[PDB]
Amino acid sequence: KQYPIINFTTAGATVQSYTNFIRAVRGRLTTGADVRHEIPVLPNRVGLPINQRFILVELSNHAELSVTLALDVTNAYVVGYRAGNSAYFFHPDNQEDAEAITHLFTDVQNRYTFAFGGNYDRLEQLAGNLRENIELGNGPLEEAISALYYYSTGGTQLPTLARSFIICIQMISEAARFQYIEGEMRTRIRYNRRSAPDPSVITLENSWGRLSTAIQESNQGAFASPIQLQRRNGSKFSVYDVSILIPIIALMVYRCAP
Numbered sequence: 001k002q003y004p005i006i007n008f009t010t011a012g013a014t015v016q017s018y019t020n021f022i023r024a025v026r027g028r029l030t031t032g033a034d035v036r037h038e039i040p041v042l043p044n045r046v047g048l049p050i051n052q053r054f055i056l057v058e059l060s061n062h063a064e065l066s067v068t069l070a071l072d073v074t075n076a077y078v079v080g081y082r083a084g085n086s087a088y089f090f091h092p093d094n095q096e097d098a099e100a101i102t103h104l105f106t107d108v109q110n111r112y113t114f115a116f117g118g119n120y121d122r123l124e125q126l127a128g129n130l131r132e133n134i135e136l137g138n139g140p141l142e143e144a145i146s147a148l149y150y151y152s153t154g155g156t157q158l159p160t161l162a163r164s165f166i167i168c169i170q171m172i173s174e175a176a177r178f179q180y181i182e183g184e185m186r187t188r189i190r191y192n193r194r195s196a197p198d199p200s201v202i203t204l205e206n207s208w209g210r211l212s213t214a215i216q217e218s219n220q221g222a223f224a225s226p227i228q229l230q231r232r233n234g235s236k237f238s239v240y241d242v243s244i245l246i247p248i249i250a251l252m253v254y255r256c257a258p
C-alpha cells in the first residue's frame with residue numbers, strides 16, 4: 001500500500017550512518033535491477049508496474065522537521081517531495097510520467113506541479129548559483145531539509161528551494177549513482193566540512209547518461225567512441241572501456257544493446 005521508505009537524519013549523522021543510508025537507497029533502487037553484468041542496470045521504464053516504480057526517502061534534521069523525497073527507480077532521480085499536507089512535483093516530460101506521479105502521496109490535501117523540470121541547468125537558474133558555488137555536506141543538507149519543509153508554510157522562497165534541491169539531489173541521487181560521489185560526501189562528513197563539488201564531481205554528474213550508453217553499447221567492454229571526464233584539478237582525460245568505471249559508477253539507466 002506504500003512504496004519502500006528509507007530514513008536518514010542529519011542529527012548526529014556519521015560516516016557510518018550516511019554509508020548505511022546510501023547502501024539502503026542503492027538496495028531499494030536495485031530490487032528490480034539487472035545485476036548480471038559488470039555494473040547494475042536500473043529497471044527499464046517500459047512495462048514497469050506502477051507499484052514498483054518509486055521509492056521514498058524520508059529526511060529529518062536536528063530541528064526534527066521531516067520531508068519525503070520520491071525517487072524514480074528507473075533513473076534514481078528525485079521527481080517530487082512531500083512536506084506536511086502538501087506534495088510538490090517537477091514538471092513531467094510526458095503524459096505517462098504525469099500519470100505515474102498521481103500514484104505518489106495520494107493522501108495529501110494539496111498537490112502542486114512546478115512549471116519547471118528538475119534538471120541542474122534549470123535549478124541553477126532558479127537558485128541563482130551554479131553547482132560549483134553551492135556547498136555540500138551535513139550542514140548544507142540540514143539547512144536544505146528545513147528549507148524544503150518551510151516551503152509548504154510560505155517561509156522559503158523559490159531560489160532557496162532550488163538550491164536545496166541541488167543539495168539533496170547530489171547527496172542522495174548522485175551519491176547512489178556513483179561510488180565516487182558517495183566517497184566525496186563521506187570525506188565531507190568525516191572532517192565536518194562543507195564545500196562545493198570540484199570539477200570531477202560535476203563532470204561525472206553531467207556524464208551519467210552518456211556513460212550509461214557507452215557502457216551498455218560496449219563490445220567486449222570496449223567503447224565505440226571515448227567519453228571525456230575530469231580530474232579534481234579540472235584536467236581532462238578519456239575513458240575507453242567499462243572495467244575502469246566499475247569502481248566509479250554504481251547504477252545505470254537502462255539503455256538498449258545492439
Ligand SMILES: O=C(O)c1cc2c(s1)-c1ccc(F)cc1CC2
Nearest residue numbers: 200230231232233239244245248
Ligand atoms: O582527481 C583525480 O586524480 C581523479 C579524478 C577522477 C579520476 S582520477 C577517475 C579515473 C578513471 C575513471 F574511469 C573515472 C574517474 C572519476 C574522476
